[PDB]
Design a binder for these strands. Structure first.
Lengths: 57, 56
DNA sequence: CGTAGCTAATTAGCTACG
DNA sequence: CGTAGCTAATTAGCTACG
């Protein structure tokens, strides 16, 4: 079970979505941010967003 | 559009035209003029100092 | 201090083409 | 039709000098 993330949707509302896919966006040598792929349940569209630094990848 | 004599990160010397130029200066100081270059050898970008007379 | 935008990975959502 | 190729969008640290 992948943990849900609290995100402000592109629509505007807040929601506890669970990422379709998770990966680390980082230039070599150092860690960067964690990016999750989300699907807006409302409009059906996709959007990316930063994840908490301690989110399990 | 004027070429600038820069030392590439690759190590070689080249006469390159900067894609983007601007002034990197704090308040009250002159600072420097910075150019955005692209190493033709590797395709890698790098910043470098431009002459103080360069058109910004 | 000060500006500017590349860099990394990922894929949906296009367009393009054979 | 099927497939291949390009971009938008997502972060923050990095680097250039004086």
């Amino acid at each position: 079970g992948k943990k849900p993330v609290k995100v402000k949707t592109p629509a505007g509302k807040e929601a506890e979505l669970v990422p379709e896919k998770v990966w680390a966006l980082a230039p070599k040598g150092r860690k960067g941010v964690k990016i999750g792929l989300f699907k807006d349940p409302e409009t059906g569209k996709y959007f990316r967003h930063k994840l908490p630094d301690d989110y399990p990848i």
